[PDB]
Subunit: 279 residues, 4 copies
């Protein structure tokens, strides 16, 4: 006997778990995007301009921080997420600078990976010049069914957002390394340096000999604790998933931490970033 | 072993229960308010202009529908709610008409009853409204009503000297005594959904303590709960909230209410003026 | 991600909730029955011997304390319950006096009301007893009381031609109307624990539907729930269970009950004889 | 709003989860102890008689099947478990043969590992001749705190049940092998052959690079599904845990599937069985 159904709000009532220890401390966590690194800004801006990108779809924009950078650099951006919880900060900022003309034109909407075609809006045009999905968000999507086919669908829908000749930019942490050291240490984000000091417990879940989940239990120092989970995408496999998603008719390369990656290199990157161009 | 903590979102992941069969029927319920009755609009507009109210605080604005009416009628409105999931529709609409000047000036923020002083953004508000039976959403978790006392004190303190509080509650005198909260009885917004409602009364230690409605409305279920505030007792809660320096009257369904009258109202609305 | 399914034990592991602060206070509650009142013993023994009952079925024997009395008094008793956790104490005691011949012959098995025919182990029982307000444990999950109908039919069918059913329920007429189930009022076993009880009444669609007692008794909490059976309605349930071929009378606290009497009883006991 | 507290029964009511899909199918599972293997009976009986054991403590007797064998072979047995759910079948059988004199003397009680000293009863004597904990039950005990110290305590208490000169017989599946193939296949129990046909999903949980849990999700064929978890005890470590438990004053050896085990041997045993004698 719950007093209200799961997932239903009520006027003057916080939504179900808004108020808990874990929530309060996770918000402190997605509120540390106050230092975009210089190397990241110069590489994303450089890639999108080498390719003549003007219209960009930011998938899983979260708080909207990559997107605000884009809007400020003159791109025509539409930014979507499934999480209303995160989208609220994006929408706030647009509203604050609602009065800068670049931000008037900023499009922000709700979308889900699984229905991404129906959810995203597409102008007197059709087809985005580049679609970005960065910060290791794709890995947030679990393989609930078991065979990865939700990953297949999600990547098909993202794929289909990319116009002919356009780019998909999409990253994951280096799960090869993680599975093999058994750790996902903190302080490694190459997009935004934190200055929070954190401990992390790393839990690796292997089902029937295939890694299936990586779960990180954070302690941040005011001592507090939250948990986030990821699907451990191995490099070789993800590349394939992406290839399948454009049906082979594409050009693919791999960066490790913004730089070209050649298998065997001695530098072990924190992140792998895939840039595909639709042919 | 949850895979993520309760209450923590993730890029490209629906928040925890956004997607359930209850949620997706409750957002049809939150969205069936497309017909503010003529009677209500003429009453609220009347009461606010009779008193010279200009700057208004809408507490628990939910989708912002009363507030949109106020913005359109030339009031200076700040509208708050605790629920981000309802506030999202208010924010959306402001954004869409962001281009009308009245809506540029519409202020919308998060606030919670228990910290209302710190949350809301000068020398008071002229009138503060809390209508649609929103106050009744607030449960008495502790047991002694000490959270309604605090909430009311915070709402109270939003009202400047000489200003108004308008605050309503469904007629729980009558519900408790028939054991039923029937649907179709909102005097503010006429639905055209047809619904069945199961009414559950929870009495703790001989005091009514909760009223829980299980709706059926494409057939499917959700549940909402309410604290059954009795008329005599609410009046007292409000009187305590201004410390007795106030004047109070009671409407039943927009009309003056005299105890004993034969017309049994669906809602009681208190209008208080701070002295 | 539970680590083991709900309801599956494991060598050298306490079953799921055996160890909680509620459990370990409820087993103090199940164990405070060390004083069967003189009045009760003289009544039940009297009623069973008046009627010539020899072979008796104790339904919902719990710790087996009424049954132990019967074994000691020379009856041929089979005692069943659904709960393994309460049945464990019955079984223990039989084992300890396994060496007295009366206890060798004591039959103790698991059974559930809903399949009672298949579960209990010839040509009927002489009397079937269901005392201590155990029947009221059975909730009306479906909504229409169709599970009490089935249960009663199964209990009924345990009673041979010319035999008795003795079955009681607390006075829920009176509880519903004061809104309180006070403690200290068991007429079968006097506690000397001191307890506070919060009484919660749940009324669905104007029918009382559940009574939930939150006990406080070294201070700590547990909760038990009950279906509030009203006297007039229970009588009918029982009449339907024998198909009308039966005779029925009502005691209030071991004494004849005439509607209107000034003595308001704690318990109603039905004694029915199959014809 | 639960209607009764977790863990409290009521007359004429099944206990909380007694009735579910999972329960109903797990009972089918511990009801397959109808074929003790010949090799096991001849080895346990032989070991206990080589050492002159007469008084035996069966820890985690579950349904009581090893114990009934012992009572029938003339041992003075006391059999304990924490699970009332399993103990119920042991108690049933004793009651049925209550009238055989060997079974009259059979002692059956509730005990928990963590309080095992206080819980078990000890005759006009003190100290059991041998204490057995077989069938991989010890592995049922989780490391909830994190540092294995519950294992330390539990093994101290079992240890302390063993009289001077007496034996502790205590086994675990071969978790070395399991962790390394990522599988715990079915059909491997060397004590009781099943004739149920089962599929198993094997899930390995590695926390901060130490294996922490092995969770088995069974499907049995009437198609039904239940889950059981285990702590993955590695051979080298368990031996140490046991050594620590007698404080070094003991004699230890290891069997693999009833036979002597020498590290490096080509036969990979399903189970490791430790026989320690207290000095």
């Amino acid at each position: 006997y719950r007093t209200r159904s799961l997932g239903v709000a009520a006027e003057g009532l916080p939504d179900q778990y808004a108020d808990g220890e874990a929530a309060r401390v996770w918000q402190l966590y997605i509120g540390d995007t106050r230092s975009r690194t210089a190397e990241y800004k110069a590489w994303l801006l450089g890639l999108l301009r080498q390719h003549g990108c003007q219209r960009v779809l930011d998938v899983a924009c979260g708080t909207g921080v990559d997107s605000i950078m884009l809007v400020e650099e003159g791109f025509s951006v539409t930014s979507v997420d499934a999480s209303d919880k995160m989208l609220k900060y994006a929408l706030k900022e647009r509203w604050n600078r609602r009065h800068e003309p670049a931000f008037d034109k900023w499009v922000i909407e709700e979308a889900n990976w699984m229905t991404l075609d129906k959810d995203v809006p597409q102008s007197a045009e059709g087809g985005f010049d580049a679609v970005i999905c960065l910060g290791n968000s794709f890995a947030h999507l679990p393989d609930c069914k078991g065979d990865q086919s939700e990953h297949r669908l999600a990547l098909k829908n993202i794929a289909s957002m990319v116009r002919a000749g356009g780019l998909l930019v999409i990253d994951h942490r280096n799960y090869d390394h993680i599975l093999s050291t058994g750790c996902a240490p903190p302080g490694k984000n190459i997009y935004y340096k934190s200055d929070l000091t954190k401990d992390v417990t790393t839990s690796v879940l292997i089902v029937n000999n295939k890694a299936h989940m990586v779960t990180l239990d954070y302690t941040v120092q005011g001592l507090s604790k939250f948990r986030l989970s990821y699907y451990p995408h191995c490099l070789a496999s993800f590349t394939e998933l992406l290839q399948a998603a454009f049906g082979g008719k594409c050009q693919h390369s791999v960066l490790g931490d913004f730089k070209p990656y050649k298998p065997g290199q001695t530098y072990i990157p924190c992140y792998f970033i895939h840039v595909l161009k639709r042919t």
